[PDB]
Amino acid sequence: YQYKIQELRKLLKSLLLNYLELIGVLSINPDMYERKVENIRTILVNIHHLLNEYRP
Amino acid sequence: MNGNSTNNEQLQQELATTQDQVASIIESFVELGVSIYDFPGTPEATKGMITNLQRNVDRLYKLNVRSNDPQSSLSKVDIPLEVVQYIEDGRNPDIYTREFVEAIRRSNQYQRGKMHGLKQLRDSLADKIVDEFPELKEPVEDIIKRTSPIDNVSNTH
């Protein structure tokens, strides 16, 4: 499961970077926010699904 | 832009001559009002009142058929409901213009405050991300560069 744990770290870092990018997009033009919210949505469900895979 | 300039010139001319026509209508109104208030009952006074109604009807004729005239910006000029009810309330419509353009500047400044607060959040959070995680320096710099692109609609004030 070490691959999943490092993937979880990578997903956390990607979520933080995606939040920072969302703040940048909101700070210059809040009309392409839909794809960034979608990316945060899929990053979060990937994080939660990796936790559910680690649950057994 | 030449067409807009010249048609706004006939806007100004058409509004000025309608000022004249409406003022003439109000002057006809003041004279039949004083006719009612000091009516002597003479047939000459009655015929003068009849001619007053004649001139009122033909002034309304001219301005109504000119409201249906194609050679007119009477239709191209636009009127909303708030200014007409505001004048009906007895209040000065230049205050309506003032409040509306001040609302323009309020929304511009409020959205600009949103943008600058979001920029403060962005660069403070980016600096703290770089300070905490030294391996995120390149992605944060890429994100800041991409979310601060080349300025084409920000260099000008």
How far is B63 from B48, CA to CA, in rounded Å?
Answer: 23
Q: What letter represents residue B17's amino acid?
A: T
Q: Are B5 and B73 in contact (CB under 8 A)?
A: no
Q: Are A25 and A36 in contact (CB under 8 A)?
A: yes
Determination technique for this entry: cryo-EM
Question: Which of A13, A21, A27 is closest, CB to CB, to B136?
Answer: A13
How far is B130 from A19, CA to CA, in rounded Å?
Answer: 14
Q: CB of A37 within 8 Å of any CB in chain B?
A: no
How far is A31 from A20, CA to CA, in rounded Å?
Answer: 16
Cβ separation of B143 and A21 shorter than 8 Å? yes
A30, two tokens: 């809040």
The DSSP letter of residue B149 is: -
Question: Which residue in chain B is spatially nearest to A29 when comparing CA positions?
Answer: B115
Q: Counting one residue from A and one from B, how many pairs have CB atoms under 8 Å apart? A: 42
Q: Name residues whose C-beta falls within 8 Å of residue B29's C-beta, 6 or more positions apart in sequence.
A: B56
B117 to chain A, minimum CA–CA distance in Å?
Answer: 8
**What is the H or E stretch that residue B32 is in?**
helix B2-37
Say whether B24 sits in a helix, a strand or coil: helix
For residue B126, the tally of other CB atoms under 10 A from its CB is 21
Cβ separation of A17 and B147 shorter than 8 Å? no
Q: Are B118 and A26 in contact (CB under 8 A)?
A: yes
> What's phi and psi for B8, nearest 5 deg?
-65, -30
Q: What letter represents residue B122's amino acid?
A: R
Q: CB of A32 within 8 Å of any CB in chain B?
A: no
**What is the H or E stretch that residue B102 is in?**
helix B93-132
Cβ separation of B121 and A13 shorter than 8 Å? no
How far is B24 from A17, CA to CA, in rounded Å?
Answer: 71
With an 8 Å Cβ cutoff, the interface of chain B facing chain A consists of 115, 118-119, 121-122, 125-126, 129, 133, 136, 139-140, 143-144, 146-149
How far is B155 from B157, CA to CA, in rounded Å?
Answer: 6
Interface test with B, best of A6, A12, A21 (most B CBs within 10 A): A21
**What is the H or E stretch that residue B143 is in?**
helix B137-146
> What's phi and psi for B114, nearest 5 deg?
-55, -45
A56 to chain B, minimum CA–CA distance in Å?
Answer: 31
Report in angstroms the alpha-carbon separations of B98 from B83, B86, B92, B95.
12, 13, 10, 5
B61, two tokens: 């004729």
Q: Name residues whose C-beta falls within 8 Å of residue A43's C-beta, 6 or more positions apart in sequence.
A: A11, A14, A15, A18
Q: What letter represents residue B6's amino acid?
A: T
Resolution (angstroms) stands at 3.0
Best CA proximity match to B74, nearest among B147, B144, B14? B14
Length of chain B, in residues: 157
**What's the number of CA atoms in the CB half-sphere (13 Å) around residue B152?**
1
Cβ separation of A17 and B140 shorter than 8 Å? yes
Neighboring chain A residues of B150 at a CB cutoff of 8 Å: none
CA angle in degrees (0–180, nearest 5) for A27-A30-A33: 110
